Each structure stands twice: as C-alpha cells, then as structure tokens.
C-alpha cells in the first residue's frame, strides 16, 4: 500500500549543538543517530558494562576447548593413518602446507614434512 501517512520531523527552532552532525534527520519522524546505539537507550536497557562482563567469562568459555586440543592432543588419537598414495602421487600432495597428509605419523619423513609446514609471514632474503 503506497501512500501511507507518515509524520514529518520538525525544523530546528533553537541554537544547535556544536557537533550536531551525529543526528540523522531525513525529514520524517523519527530521526536516528548517525550510527545506531552510539547514544540513546540500548534495546532491552542493556549497557556496555553488561556485555563486557558477560563476555569476560563467555569468551574464555569458547576459547577453552580449542587451546586444550591444540596443546594436549596430537595425531596419534586417530584409529587410522591418513589416505595412502604412491610415492609419485604423495610427493606433490604433501607439498601443500594446507594438506591433511602431514598428519601421517607412519611416513618415514613425518618430522621433516611437519618442519616444512611451519607458517611464515615475512619472506626472507
């Protein structure tokens, strides 16, 4: 239904604040802050202290299991070794740092392939 009524926003009839360009007045009622939740009451009357306080527990509750398995569990937990390939096929497949074949602890060059899968950031000269 086009043409529905909508209330208009009043023009300023008093001296303006110095930093008035933080209100978005598009012509209709109501205007909004330039970014939502920057000022004014938040939905549900929550505050920044509420979210920071709940997150100070909830963030370590989500980061806890990843740390535990990345530091206290290794490749030998699996009941089987990775998929086996002929040497000419395998030798190019494990050149990728991305590959899941570097977790083959039965390979004769398991350590050397793991030492070549260390992530670097600045390319050396």
């Amino acid at each position: 239904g086009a043409g529905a009524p909508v209330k208009l926003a009043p023009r300023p009839d008093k001296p303006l604040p110095t930093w008035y360009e933080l209100w978005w007045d598009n012509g209709y009622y109501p205007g909004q802050p330039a970014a939502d939740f920057m000022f004014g009451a938040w939905p549900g009357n929550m505050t920044e202290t509420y979210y920071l306080r709940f997150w100070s527990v909830f963030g370590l509750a989500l980061a806890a299991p990843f740390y535990y398995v990345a530091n206290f569990t290794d490749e030998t937990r699996m009941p089987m070794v990775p998929q086996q390939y002929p040497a000419e096929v395998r030798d190019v497949l494990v050149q990728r740092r991305n590959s899941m074949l570097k977790h083959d602890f039965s390979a004769p060059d398991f350590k050397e392939v793991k030492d070549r899968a260390k992530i670097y950031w600045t390319p050396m000269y």
Partner: protein
C-alpha cells in the same frame, strides 16, 4: 501537528549532550583499534626481531 495523535508528539526530547568522549576512553579504544586493524605491522616487526636475534646468536657462538 495533524498526525501527532496518531504517531506521537514532539514533546519528548532526545537525551544527549552532543559532547566528545572522555579522554581515557578515546585513548584506550584507539590503541585497541590500532592493535586490531594494523596487526600485519606488529607481525612483521616481530619477524624482524626474531630474525636479528638469531643472527646475534650465530655471531656470538661463532666467534669463540
């Protein structure tokens, strides 16, 4: 004012003083922003430090 009895009037005003943020809040949030949005700079600085300390170890134990 022909729609004020339908959608509300203009009597309730916005409670905001349009004032700048506090100095400590601004400084702390800006430092956090620099750390988050410029993390390659810190990664590469750490790479340079880890590289030069290894050459220090080589030059120390080599000439002995």
């Amino acid at each position: 004012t022909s729609l004020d009895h339908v959608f509300g009037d203009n009597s309730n005003k916005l409670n905001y003083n349009f004032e700048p943020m506090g100095m400590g809040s601004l400084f702390i949030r800006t430092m956090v922003m620099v750390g988050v949005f410029f993390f390659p700079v810190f990664i590469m600085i750490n790479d340079d430090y880890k590289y030069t300390s290894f050459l220090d170890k080589v030059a120390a134990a080599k000439a002995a």
